[PDB]
Amino acid sequence: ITLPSHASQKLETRSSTWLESREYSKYLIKVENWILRNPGYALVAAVIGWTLGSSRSQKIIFVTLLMLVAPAYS
Amino acid sequence: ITLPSHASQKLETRSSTWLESREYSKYLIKVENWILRNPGYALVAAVIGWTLGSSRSQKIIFVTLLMLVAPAYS
Amino acid sequence: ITLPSHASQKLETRSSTWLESREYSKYLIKVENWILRNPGYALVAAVIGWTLGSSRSQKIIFVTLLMLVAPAYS
Amino acid sequence: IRCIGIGNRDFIEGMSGGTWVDIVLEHGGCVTVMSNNKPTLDFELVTTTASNMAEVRSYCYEANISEMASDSRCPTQGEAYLDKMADSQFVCKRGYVDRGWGNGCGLFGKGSIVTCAKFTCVKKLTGKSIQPENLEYRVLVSVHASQHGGMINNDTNHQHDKENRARIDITASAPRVEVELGSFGSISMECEPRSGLNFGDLYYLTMNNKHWLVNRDWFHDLSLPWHTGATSNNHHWNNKEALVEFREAHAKKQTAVVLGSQEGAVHAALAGALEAESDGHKATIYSGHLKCRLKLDKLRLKGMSYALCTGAFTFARTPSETIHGTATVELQYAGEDGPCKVPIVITSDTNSMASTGRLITANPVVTESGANSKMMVEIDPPFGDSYIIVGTGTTKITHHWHRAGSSIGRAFEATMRGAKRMAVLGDTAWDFGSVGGMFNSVGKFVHQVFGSAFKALFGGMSWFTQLLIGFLLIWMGLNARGGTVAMSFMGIGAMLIFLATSVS
Amino acid sequence: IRCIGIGNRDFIEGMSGGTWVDIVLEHGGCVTVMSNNKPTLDFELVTTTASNMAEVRSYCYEANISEMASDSRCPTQGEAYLDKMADSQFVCKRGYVDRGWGNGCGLFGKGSIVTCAKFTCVKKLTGKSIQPENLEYRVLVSVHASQHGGMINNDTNHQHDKENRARIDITASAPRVEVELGSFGSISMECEPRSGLNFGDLYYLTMNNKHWLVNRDWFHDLSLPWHTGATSNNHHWNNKEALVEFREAHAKKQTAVVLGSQEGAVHAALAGALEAESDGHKATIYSGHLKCRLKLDKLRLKGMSYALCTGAFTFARTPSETIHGTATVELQYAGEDGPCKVPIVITSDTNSMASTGRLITANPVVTESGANSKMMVEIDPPFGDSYIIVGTGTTKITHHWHRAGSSIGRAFEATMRGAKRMAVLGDTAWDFGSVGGMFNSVGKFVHQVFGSAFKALFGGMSWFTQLLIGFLLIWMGLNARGGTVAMSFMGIGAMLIFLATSVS
Amino acid sequence: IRCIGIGNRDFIEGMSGGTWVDIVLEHGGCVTVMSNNKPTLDFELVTTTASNMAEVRSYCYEANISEMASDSRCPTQGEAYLDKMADSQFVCKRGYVDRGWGNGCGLFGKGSIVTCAKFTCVKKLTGKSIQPENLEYRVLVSVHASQHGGMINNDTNHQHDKENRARIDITASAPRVEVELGSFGSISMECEPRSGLNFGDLYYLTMNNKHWLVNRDWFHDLSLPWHTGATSNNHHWNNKEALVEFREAHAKKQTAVVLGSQEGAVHAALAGALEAESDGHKATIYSGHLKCRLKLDKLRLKGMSYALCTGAFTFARTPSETIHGTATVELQYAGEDGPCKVPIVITSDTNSMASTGRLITANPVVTESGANSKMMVEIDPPFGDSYIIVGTGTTKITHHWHRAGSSIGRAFEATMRGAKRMAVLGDTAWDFGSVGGMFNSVGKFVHQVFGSAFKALFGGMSWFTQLLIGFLLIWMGLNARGGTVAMSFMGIGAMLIFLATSVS
Ligand SMILES: *[C@@H]1O[C@H](CO[C@@H]2O[C@@H](C)[C@@H](O)[C@@H](O)[C@@H]2O)[C@@H](O[C@@H]2O[C@H](CO)[C@@H](O)[C@H](O)[C@H]2NC(C)=O)[C@H](O)[C@H]1NC(C)=O
Ligand SMILES: *[C@@H]1O[C@H](CO[C@@H]2O[C@@H](C)[C@@H](O)[C@@H](O)[C@@H]2O)[C@@H](O[C@@H]2O[C@H](CO)[C@@H](O)[C@H](O)[C@H]2NC(C)=O)[C@H](O)[C@H]1NC(C)=O
Ligand SMILES: *[C@@H]1O[C@H](CO[C@@H]2O[C@@H](C)[C@@H](O)[C@@H](O)[C@@H]2O)[C@@H](O[C@@H]2O[C@H](CO)[C@@H](O)[C@H](O)[C@H]2NC(C)=O)[C@H](O)[C@H]1NC(C)=O
């Protein structure tokens, strides 16, 4: 199945949420492990982003967005 | 916890994979749910994409990448 | 219920089809009844057709297509 | 002789040297084959039959509902529920009503309501499948053997006339038959009982003792309750909501009502389907064709060595003209000359007595050896005036014949008949009265290609859309004189219009 | 005194002119209210309780299957069928297998197959609704009445201490209470129990004796088998296919397998929800806030007409410093001149006896008439060096005190505390310690408008998306051509980044 | 004959000159090999088996905790410490609580606390490694030896049919077998049991009696408690903090709670893995391929020197068509002229009687000498109409056959099947039906290098990312400067899209 992810109730009360100790590790570990398991996609994304964008900032932003889209297939 | 997702073994053998019948439902359902639940994000994503891109294609790709990154928080 | 309409098996064999005597009645009667009971739509369609067509033939074709589309709402 | 009164009749003037010919038997037709020194034969495909049909699906067209019940919930308390929602024989639906202190609720707002009703089918229709290896065609063969006119549509004691009549059953596991015809020898038929009519695209529909042949796409898009042809005792009806409507009356109550019998709506939906009949458990069909090949090398004329008759001939009936221009002459012979040869001339000028028209009944003879016996000849007289002179010596009778028309009008009528046959049979029309050839094969191939393209483009169109599209195509072909494109557009338009205005 | 060991503690210096003040109680906090000639009071909201909750929907998270069966049909013979498809407790599926002469069929091709298995739930979770008119808040009030230090977190015989402690139950049909505090008079509370935490878009989820408060959208997007919250003997499970998977093995057979227990998957899906507890059938909640208005006009000091104490004092233990900078001093008193007033000064230099720090415990007294009795005072010494001087005459005892820090750091930490309160409470933060005023009203209005807009745009983001969008906005602002959009972009980005990296 | 009713079936028309051919057996398919003067053979890889697998790592997915203990310190007294923090069977964590006079401490502030609980695994999943020397493939071979139709999937007394059936076991210690086939001679297979499926980067995962083949770097990235090596009672676990959560509620105490069973979460994480089965301690696998070289020199036709039959044949069933366009004809034969050669012609012109198609069962014969015995032929009839004529003289029998389609459609279907095999097998697809040649060599080499590069760049990508990257590459190609880059982008994108939409 694919159960939905609950939105963060942080900053709604003074209490801590259900698994707040892992709220940061969740995305970081996933993204890092995916990037280590698939190093060629980094080259693919670099090529695509450098071809699509005109200015260097646009190229960097394209590359970052692609590298973020890949591991969480969205 | 955050268990990793297995890569698809489709087109490795002649057999069907473990939960192949649901291989399209997950991403589509998640993305469409999040997208039609949060309309203001569409506005801010469009503003950012139009402000960052230069050509029409660049702005469209920017907006698409943002609208794909947001639901699956990556 | 909107049951589907069977395609005509005319010219498939030498036999006559199921209700072939009414093959022409079923469209002409309906079209002309609707066109007579709705005279204002004729003027609407004429205005639209003359506004969209450039040459006289395009205008006549547009008007005819609208006048045909309206009775059988498709 | 069985093809004489028929109005849709074809003539195969057999090749002189050849001994085989390709024909296509149709259900509303009749073929008359004549060869040089052989008797004339009449072929008629009478019945198609399909057996061992498998039931595919049953649709309900008349149903009832009973035991309706409802349940309601207060707002913010989830959906309502009845135990009948756990019964497959019940159809249920959920909606919202108004709830407040007046309805016995603690809050104000939209409450959930559920209505359930027991579905029950009263009348259902059935669809069955037909396998081309289960078809069985029936062909009847008659000989122009000088039987008298009272035998054309006469079947009394037909099981004894083993010489002039023949019945032939054609299946896929016996597509080649040797038909013996008594003293006339025998013919051989090689038919193709798997490629006549595309039964692999048709279901056999049965509704209240009436039967149709329908498309499969149309049958699978019916929107009634249905269950499987794999019949059990108690069936689960799928899609019960097609015959049951639920309505909320001003947000205070929900109710269920069943729609009426859909028999007439189905009849109206079947407008262009084919009709059919039943024979016990078998489908009896009276449409479609059967391509066959005839080999006549063992067919011989009986009585070519008889002597001429010597007695007296009378016209037993007035010579009548058939629809295609041939003439039937019934003679009565006084004389015990036994089986003898009938002397008959068809001449334009009686000075030279030169024959000008041919016979259909080859070798007319007096069959019986009795005193006053009857026989019938069929002839193809020439255009204009002529004389049919019968008998010998000075006691011979004459009949004046006038045949209106010309050979040009005959050729035009033949062209129209061939165009209609093409429009009905496609490329199979090129196998009618064919003995082979390069022109035949090339034409059939080109026709096959063009017919495939045409059926792909304009396949499922009614006469209305055919007319509209044809007029549009003619118009755009008029105002476009590019290379080879104008004539293509206007030709396709003319084809579509000719198909639209055609008759069955 | 119940507020002394708490790390999240607020100090309200009530306005002298008026007698009412607005406070907001939170669950992980406690408020100390001090007014000029009245006792100091401690307020703590300890429990929220929801009763009369309605069940909305049950979800299955662990199920079994049994009684599997299959059935197959020959090609072109319709779909397969089992009587178990007429049973609502079975889940079934249809697919295609290969059929031919080897399998017992007369044809070759894809035949239809159906597989059915009986579904059974073994473990389910529930969701319930909470109406704001069913909440009940519990507030505890303590008086700084010079009880000794061994009474701070002491609940022994608390039902008898009717003068120093009070327990208040605030409901919607009783939101205004007169709290009687013995010889201290009374206070009046006017609370708003209907507009605290927004329980209107929250469900109370129960799974295996654990409880959460979850979003309603999230609860309806669950992908498990479910049935209605209505009561019934046998429930029909909707969406059984969420826990059963059907699979064809190389087009030769079809088989059903159930998925495993989903308890851990749900635990992982609830990552950001709020936890809760149970009490019988009632939900016990330890999150959220409660806005109240305090009226202290009938509050009076007990023992403002006491005589000074004449005996000698000792320090019963070392004065300690609380994390907010105040100091607790426990004294022991000898001699029995009944309840008397404790003389205590806080001075920068013992020569001048000039008071420089104030008291938190207003009007410190000896409470008993016994020989050696203990009492406790709370003081607020000045920054730097000071002296706590207790007693009068030749028996004055002195303790040197040092308070680190400065007033600038105090103002900075007050500003950060106020900013955190704004981030948690929204516009309700403007009602904390408020006595009216135009500035507070304008601020609350502007905050309401901007908070509504901010929630509309950036409502559904996580810390990751907040960080990303914030950096993108800061970049877009650093490159804006003209002003008023650069500062706007950078401000929104900095706000998002501050929200993303927050804690608690 | 075991390959007839199979949907995934290949036809290797063997080389004429050579005597060996390369084939690739797959678990879902089956191969039919026909050579010039040899019988037709059917090959099917039916089982892969792995024995003595090496335990790699165990993960816990359901756990308990017990014997909770805690230790607290007053502020400025260091960290809290428990003796169980030295025991590896305990999971512990440190936090901070609020401390003051109310708790029993002499100062106010954050005191250190530590909590410890005894971890115990209730349910665990195991991973094993499969070595290429552990694998044992099982292949089945059948001969088209005119067995009747009731022997297609018939395994009764299969240990007595030593002439028509054969069972082959391929291991890495015996990659070459010779198979005797009675009077048909023998074949020789030289397989590569060390290069079929990349078991070098797959683990055999077992969880609650279900088994998968999973990636290795996915199995190493699981986030559960784990240990390495064999498994015995009261084991030791690493990373127990993955199933246990510690919490401080409002800085007042610390509690530990264990997460729920992760069976379903693992099931959901295994979405794209391959399934498998068990046979005691042996992995039973039904996926992957096996490449072999077939040598057919000592393979000879049996009964090629029989006499033609003379009795009368009948059709025992209706000739049916398999989904690839062939036809199976079951014949019954009366008469006892012993093992005789069956006369059978497939002709599309009864005038010439010339053969048009080709048999699949080479040299069809009557295999018995009894009264009425059955046999079965398999034919590849030509497109269009044709006749299947069996017998000689006057007792001949005929069956009409129609085969729809054309040779262009056949070629297109063959191209699609070849592209699918390429996509599934990589460069190994060049060894299918291969007889050598340098064209095959260079093609396989180029496919090898391009597939290596393509797998390095786009190896692990779901259909979603495949689609997105493909569309982006197609756009980049459509807007490229010229050639030599544009069409490369378009080809890579089109390949990604063709992969993302493929099935099976
Ligand atoms: C319709 O046919 C019957 C039967 O004809 C006989 O059987 C045929 C197969 C063929 O062999 C004929 O030559 C046979 O005579 C006719 O009935 C016969 O009529 C003749 C003369 O009228 C008489 O001598 C026979 O006894 C009759 N036999 C029977 C069985 O009825 C009948 O006259 C025909 N109808 C017409 C209108 O001509
Ligand atoms: C915790 O409190 C108990 C109870 O104290 C009494 O009840 C309170 C409501 C308040 O009125 C106190 O002043 C009362 O004394 C303490 O137990 C009492 O201790 C006193 C002192 O020796 C003794 O005279 C009483 O008999 C005790 N009462 C009982 C019921 O045992 C207790 O000492 C307090 N704990 C600490 C650590 O100070
Ligand atoms: C399935 O096969 C059995 C056994 O077949 C026998 O053994 C095979 C290895 C092969 O050598 C066959 O030729 C053998 O006959 C069939 O059972 C036999 O059926 C025949 C009739 O065809 C009968 O005369 C034998 O007595 C039977 N013997 C036994 C042991 O059963 C069986 O009929 C086959 N199934 C079908 C559907 O044909």
Residue numbers in the entry:
A (entry chain D), B (entry chain F), C (entry chain B): 96 to 169
D (entry chain A), E (entry chain C), F (entry chain E): 1 to 504
What does the paper say about this structure?
The surface of mature, infectious flaviviruses is composed of an icosahedral shell of 90 flat-lying envelope (E) protein dimers, the main target of humoral immunity. In contrast to their mature counterparts, immature virions possess 60 protruding spike-like trimers of precursor membrane (prM)-E complexes (prM3E3). The pr domain of prM binds to E, obscuring the fusion peptide and thereby preventing unproductive fusion within the already infected cell. When immature virions reach the low-pH environment of the trans-Golgi network (TGN), the trimeric prM3E3 spikes rearrange into the flat-lying conformation, characteristic of the mature virus.
From the same data set, we solved the structure of the mature form of SPOV (which lacks the pr domain), allowing us to examine which changes occur during maturation. We selected mature particles and reconstructed a map to 2.6 Å resolution. The E proteins on the surface are arranged as antiparallel dimers, forming a tight cage that almost entirely covers the lipid bilayer. Unlike DENV (which is also glycosylated at Asn67), SPOV E possesses only a single glycosylation site at position Asn154. Although the domain architecture of E remains constant, there is a significant reorganization of membrane-associated helices of E, going from the immature to the mature form. In mature E, the amphipathic helix H2 is splayed away from the transmembrane bundle of TM1 and TM2, whereas amphipathic helix H1 has reoriented by almost 180°, relative to the helix bundle. Notably, although TM and amphipathic helices are tightly packed together in the immature virus, the reorganization has left a pocket-like gap in between the helices in mature SPOV. We examined the EM map in the vicinity of the pocket and found that it is occupied by strong density resembling the headgroup of a phosphatidylethanolamine lipid (PE), with partially resolved fatty-acid tails. The PE fills the pocket between the membrane-associated helices of mature E, thereby keeping them at a fixed distance and position.
